[PDB]
Ligand binder design. Sequence first.
Ligand code: STV
Ligand code: ZN
Ligand code: ZN
Ligand code: ZN
Length: 572
Amino acid sequence: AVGACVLCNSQTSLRCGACIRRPFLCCKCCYDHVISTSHKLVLSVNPYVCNAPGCDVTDVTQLYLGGMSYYCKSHKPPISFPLCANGQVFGLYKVTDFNAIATCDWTNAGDYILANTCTERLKLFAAETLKATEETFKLSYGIATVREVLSDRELHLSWEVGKPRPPLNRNYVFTGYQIGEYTFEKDAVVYRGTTTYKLNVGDYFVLTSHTVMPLSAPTLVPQEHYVRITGLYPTLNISDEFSSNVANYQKVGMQKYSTLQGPPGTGKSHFAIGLALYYPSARIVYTACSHAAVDALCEKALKYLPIDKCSRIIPARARVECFDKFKVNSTLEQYVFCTVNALPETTADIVVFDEISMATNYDLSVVNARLRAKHYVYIGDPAQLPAPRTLLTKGTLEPEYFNSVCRLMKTIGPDMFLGTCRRCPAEIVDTVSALVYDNKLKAHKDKSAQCFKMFYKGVITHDVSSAINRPQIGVVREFLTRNPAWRKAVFISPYNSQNAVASKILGLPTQTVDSSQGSEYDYVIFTQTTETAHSCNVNRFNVAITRAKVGILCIMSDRDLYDKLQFTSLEI
Ligand SMILES: CCS(=O)(=O)NCc1ccc2c(c1)OCO2
Ligand SMILES: [Zn+2]
Ligand SMILES: [Zn+2]
Ligand SMILES: [Zn+2]
């Protein structure tokens, strides 16, 4: 039990026994913690507990030292010093924010605000504590058991009594029993095995609670600015395609780390892959939280970089189908594409972390711990969607609080900004530029005259809490008959239950706003479904309308966002 203080690094024998992570706290900090919170169990070699037989005094403020032993006020010998005196807790080698991180239930937005405005070591304490709290919460849900097997994609489930039922969306991944990971959608339920298996009756499913490893590396390394490009060797022969990013690629070699804010369709993949063509000898590890973000980087690399110098790292516990054109699990290749949780312990000349709004501080820290690099480039957009915070139910998490990188991009600004959207028709670019980009995003395409908006509240029904608006889907069905070109549109809504209804009624492929992020489609049909804080989130709204290359039909519930859409209004 010999470690360093999470608040001031001072070496100590003390750990908080009431904290779920049991942080090492020094004499002067440990006191400031026990004296201000319900946390009174202090751990050393032995806990600070009354040594008198059958005594239940564990509160450090009610204990004293009797020689080399610990006793309460009722058992202490005449010659005994209190454990808590003069701003310190007795220990070898002799905070308001730490108390709030240590005691909070992570259900308030203010908990996440603090976990991002605090000191660097407190961001790791916050990130570990949050993730451990999120896992112990997965145990609170009831066990689903197979009652009947309808077919290869449908079954009926028997839930546990006394324990609540977890939300049934793709976000919540189950573990069958060890028959593989499984997912559910809406008494006929749709089952989806990450592995194909003849669903047996009696088999059960649990949300896999994974052990939270402690954090060691910071979320962001200390910034270093250099007079020249360091450890990287630029080409003089640089393809005209990537000439627009040359000044920014040099900025990347003259700093330890750099932030790139790239609104939708401004060239993030192009910038990331073009950085390899600019430093041709440099080993680049490409990382992101999701398999789809890593796969999008592989698709752009397949087009510009040699396939023999690339490798897609796939964890043996495969959950979804990912990129198959590179040699798999060769961490020895010059270009390594890998999700954060699968990263090996290696080194790199450049580390590119894409879709930075989806990262948590836990992920930022894991990347710094597994990858030791000369340069780190963080690419994403704080105006796009963050990682879901399953415990957060009160308050809204603002972009400057998503993670350390997003905090920097929203306060000091990003080091680099891609200001030209090449994907969207001008109507959409002008709407999101004013909405989330402070009028700094510019349109490359002209107005398509195929961006429509309809103010139609319809009727809101609910599959549990996931919302449906059948009259909004009815308006879409009516529109499709009059606009058959839109037969090829992707249907998007903020709710998976709305999507299930629209899939059966319209037959269009379906995507939630959160799963559509990073993807593009010629035509998009968006139904807002509700006027909630979720369906009105400006970041979700921004993602939803920036998926479209040619046209979009927005069936709106919120007068506010409807009025902001610079689209042609439709009647009915
Ligand atoms: C951080 C660089 S690395 O260790 O991942 N790649 C270098 C390398 C090492 C051994 C090899 C090889 C390439 O090809 C044959 O055997
Ligand atoms: Zn301390
Ligand atoms: Zn504590
Ligand atoms: Zn006692």
